[PDB]
């Protein structure tokens, strides 16, 4: 479910760069999230490029980089926009790992994302009306 969302979004972002999720490894929610991600990545393309140009991805530091950035993202609280950005960050990390021929990290990044959602974001999501409320507020 959270798993489902992560795989959907990462598959989409990888496909946009011409990569397939399958080589490395509800619908309304997934579509609204895909679309919010596209829009976020445009509106904050500067923040996107700032991140991408400062990622030095290695197997030994990739979890550290994920954690560092995600802790910063939610330092001042959670909102729907920040959750979208969290997905877009996961997408950027996977694309970058494949660029650097560290495709092995893709399935691992997906797992880190699901764990973060399950352990840390779920309480907020549930308190704030669940994913249905996200669709209500930011779908179409
Ligand atoms: C057409 N209609 C139906 C939808 C269109 C709109 C606009 S489309 C959008 C999507 C997500 C976030 C913002 C805009 N939808 C929308 C609007 C407001 C809200 S909202 O809930 O009010 N929230 C926010 N509103 C405005 N701006 C925000 C800016 C935010 N940022 C700014 C950059 N910062 C960089 C950063 C900082 C720290 C750590 C990491 C990063 C980082 C860097 C690179 C990457 Cl790759 C990833 C992370 C990350 C946090 C966060 C929340 C924001 C939510 C949504 N919505 O969900 O669709
Ligand atoms: Cl907080």
Nearest residue (CA) to ligand 1, atom 35: 47
Three-state helix/strand/coil letters over the chain: CHHHHHHHHHHHHHHHCCCCHHHCCCHHHHHHHHHHHHHHHHHCHHHHHHHHHHCCCCCCCHHHHHHHHHHHHCCCCCCHHHHHHHHHHHHHHHHHHHHCCCCCHHHHHHHHHHHHHHHHHHHHHHHCCHHHHHHHHHCC
Q: Using CA atoms, how far apart are residues 128 and 89, in angstroms rounded to an integer?
A: 22
Using a 6 Å CB cutoff, which residues line ligand 1? 36, 39-40, 43-44, 47-48, 51, 69, 72-73, 79-82, 84-85, 88-89, 92, 138
Neighbour-count burial of 52, counting CB atoms closer than 10 A to its CB (0-12 exposed, 13-18 middle, 19+ buried): middle
Is 24:103 a contact under the CB 8 Å cutoff?
Answer: yes
Resolution in angstroms, to 1 decimal, for this deposition? 2.0
Q: Where are the domains positioned within the chain?
A: 1-140
């Amino acid at each position: 479910s959270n798993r489902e969302l992560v795989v959907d979004f990462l598959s989409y972002k990888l496909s946009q760069k011409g990569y397939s999720w399958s080589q490395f490894s509800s619908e309304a929610v997934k579509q609204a999230l895909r679309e919010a991600g596209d829009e976020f990545e445009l509106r904050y393309r500067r923040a996107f490029s700032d991140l991408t140009s400062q990622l030095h991805i290695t197997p030994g530091t990739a979890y550290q980089s994920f954690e560092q950035v995600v802790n910063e993202l939610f330092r001042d609280g959670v909102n729907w926009g920040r959750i979208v950005a969290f997905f877009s960050f996961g997408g950027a990390l996977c694309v970058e790992s494949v660029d650097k021929e560290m495709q092995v990290l893709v399935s691992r990044i997906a797992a880190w994302m699901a764990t973060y959602l399950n352990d840390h974001l779920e309480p907020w999501i549930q308190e704030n009306g669940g994913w249905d409320t996200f669709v209500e507020l930011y779908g179409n």
